[PDB]
Amino acid sequence: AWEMGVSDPRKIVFSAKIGLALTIVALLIFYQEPNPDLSRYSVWAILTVVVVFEFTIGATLSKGFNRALGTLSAGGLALGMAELSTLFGDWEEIFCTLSIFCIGFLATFMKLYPSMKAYEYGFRVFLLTYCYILISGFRTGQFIEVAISRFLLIALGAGVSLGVNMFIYPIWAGEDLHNLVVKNFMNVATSLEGCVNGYLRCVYKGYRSAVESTSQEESLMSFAIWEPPHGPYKSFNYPWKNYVKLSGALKHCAFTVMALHGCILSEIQAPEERRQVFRQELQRVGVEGAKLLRELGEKVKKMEKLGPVDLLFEVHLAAEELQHKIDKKSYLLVNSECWEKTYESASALSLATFASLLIEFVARLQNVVDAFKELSQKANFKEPE
Amino acid sequence: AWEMGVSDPRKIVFSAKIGLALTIVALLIFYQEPNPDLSRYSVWAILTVVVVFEFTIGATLSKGFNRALGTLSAGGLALGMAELSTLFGDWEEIFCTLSIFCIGFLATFMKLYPSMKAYEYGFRVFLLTYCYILISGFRTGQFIEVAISRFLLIALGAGVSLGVNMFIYPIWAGEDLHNLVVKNFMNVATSLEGCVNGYLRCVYKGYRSAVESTSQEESLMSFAIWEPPHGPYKSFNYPWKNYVKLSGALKHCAFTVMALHGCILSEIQAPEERRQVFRQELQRVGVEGAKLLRELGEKVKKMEKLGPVDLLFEVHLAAEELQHKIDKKSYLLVNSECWEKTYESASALSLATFASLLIEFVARLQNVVDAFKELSQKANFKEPE
Numbered sequence A, B: 001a002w003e004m005g006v007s008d009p010r011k012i013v014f015s016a017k018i019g020l021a022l023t024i025v026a027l028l029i030f031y032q033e034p035n036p037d038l039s040r041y042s043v044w045a046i047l048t049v050v051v052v053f054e055f056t057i058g059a060t061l062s063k064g065f066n067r068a069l070g071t072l073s074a075g076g077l078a079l080g081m082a083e084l085s086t087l088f089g090d091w092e093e094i095f096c097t098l099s100i101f102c103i104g105f106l107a108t109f110m111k112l113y114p115s116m117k118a119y120e121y122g123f124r125v126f127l128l129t130y131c132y133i134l135i136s137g138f139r140t141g142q143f144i145e146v147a148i149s150r151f152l153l154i155a156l157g158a159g160v161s162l163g164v165n166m167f168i169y170p171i172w173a174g175e176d177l178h179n180l181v182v183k184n185f186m187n188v189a190t191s192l193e194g195c196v197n198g199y200l201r202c203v204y205k206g207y208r209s210a211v212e213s214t215s216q217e218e219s220l221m222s223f224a225i226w227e228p229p230h231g232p233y234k235s236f237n238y239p240w241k242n243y244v245k246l247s248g249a250l251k252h253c254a255f256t257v258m259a260l261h262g263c264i265l266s267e268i269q270a271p272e273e274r275r276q277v278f279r280q281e282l283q284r285v286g287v288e289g290a291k292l293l294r295e296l297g298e299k300v301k302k303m304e305k306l307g308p309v310d311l312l313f314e315v316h317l318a319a320e321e322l323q324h325k326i327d328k329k330s331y332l333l334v335n336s337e338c339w340e341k342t343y344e345s346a347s348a349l350s351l352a353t354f355a356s357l358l359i360e361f362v363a364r365l366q367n368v369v370d371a372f373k374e375l376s377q378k379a380n381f382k383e384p385e
Ligand SMILES: CCCCCCCCCCCCCCCC(=O)OC[C@H](COP(=O)(O)O)OC(=O)CCCCCCCCCCCCCCC
Pocket: A047, A048, A051, A052, A063, A064, A065, A067, A068, A071, A072, A074, A075, A076, A121, A124, A125, A128, A129, A132, A147, A150, A151, A154, A158
């Protein structure tokens, strides 16, 4: 409660924004002359205010567009069907009851398709609207009056929500994508250092946050776009896809870190006295990889290009020294007597797996540097200080 | 569309069940004497029918319980606050508008806690109810009448939905958990065989479905409990947790299969002519592991206990033969000349990683056999034919 509020002041702002919107809708109704027939309609503005308020501006705009297309296609089919109904004559109710069944079936069967498993709220409004216009007395006169007053209150509530959401401390989805990329870059370096230290000591969240985030990145990329230019992002079409391309290169790099974490929780392990022969070479690769990932995170955060020197020279030298050391002392992993116990041989062969996985991790960083160059080129980053 | 319907006949049943419930709520309103004031309330039964209908019986019961606790705590605070309001006197509206803000803030701030990120629908109903009872004329007389008629229509819609959901082709969540475990057991064996074949040939969905399913398993475990005894599950407290314990042992086994799939997409690879020396030993382990996983899946599906013989004898013999073969020909992975090129040495050392990962996969199956014995003991499985 208090802890999350002090750590996260955005949540308190969002909650006081919704409180203010509700108190404004309330004020605009408490100051009208007391009427019995006005209080009954008031519930629709409260429902609109409590349904259309989202966390981001792009989310609010996209969901409002979808809900308006739903409500209008529903009112359209309804008005394009009650006319066919009138033609039937006496057997009018049977036609309506037989059309509500088919609309319910199609609107419940088209919401269950794996490709259409996000926009359930454009289908629910369609069904609710179509059903409400055939069992409410379309042929009376009080119908149109009630419909008009309800739509008026709904439009008032949506206008209030949209103004109190767009003009007071707006939250943008592009800043959330921008910050998420930097956080993942930091976490992968922390996990790599923790893994090397744990293996050499006589991590889950780091690689897990990276591996399990593509859905969030694509959702935030789907909303950023609605939003208009603001602050550092001033072009109309901002290359938001290059951020997902760099996050994918980093996930490919983080899978080897997940396999090095898995090497520490295995049933077959190597003798401790034999792991202390390669400690220096193993620790150098970790130090250099963490330094490189942290410098790439700092360059992404500041929106700066890469300088003249090469960023992969020390890590390559470290991995070549590691390979030389392994070649010098490779008689500790195999048994030369048998050249022509199972547990002992597997425990000796277990160290080579850790070393090979570290070398594969160092070989997978060139694609991440290439994706960073592509993003720094398409987004018009500034020349380094 | 048609393809998914022919493959999945359950979706068509669910959609025709919702269509039937809507057509029944419609019939019970079209046959009452034409009234202008009755048609206006009809929308609430349609809304209830379209909101309370879930895919499973346990989900419907749990969500109905939560929505009823919400609505009653809201109406309770409202009636326990409007009285304090009356005491204020002239400055009555100010008190109401000042209480709606604090309720909106607390109900928007308590829905954002990571532990409370499932029951947003017990908070939305609370807010909607509390707000609707303070800006609707609590001190008039028409208020109680409208409230009573609206609650009557809501209860009618919920009763119809619950009867047309529980008495026509009910879907149970325990059969979905039961079937999901068997599907994951089949998929892991398919992935293992595909991985060994791809590596030896001159898979994603299998291990991915297992790795990414704990959330589904725990959701299905959270509803299968509200459901009453039926069919093969006749005890009141059915051990549904042992199914999740066996799924977790299988996920631990599937992580090595994900690392063997990752070994095929690496930048450093071994010469093809050197991979053909261990083909037979490598293929035997795969055949035996797939046979064991398929026999465990068949025993879980039929609800049968294990027989007298040991199920891990052939796989253990295969892995010991593999280790012997590797020991006989280990001069192909290292360089003895240097005993005291980087790419060549890494490519030679890459085969040992595949072999060590296969041996770790074979060493991780005893815990899965132990978890299966525990489930076959707590669930009172039958003695093998
Ligand atoms: C380019 C312009 C874009 C338009 C901008 C305005 C944005 C409007 C988006 C919100 C509109 C949907 C309402 C959402 C709130 C809500 O109450 O929606 C609440 C629920 C949805 O609930 P959930 O989505 O939470 O499950 O649906 C409804 O009850 C609304 C359906 C109508 C209610 C009965 C009134 C009949 C309609 C009267 C008007 C006639 C329309 C048809 C004429 C042909």
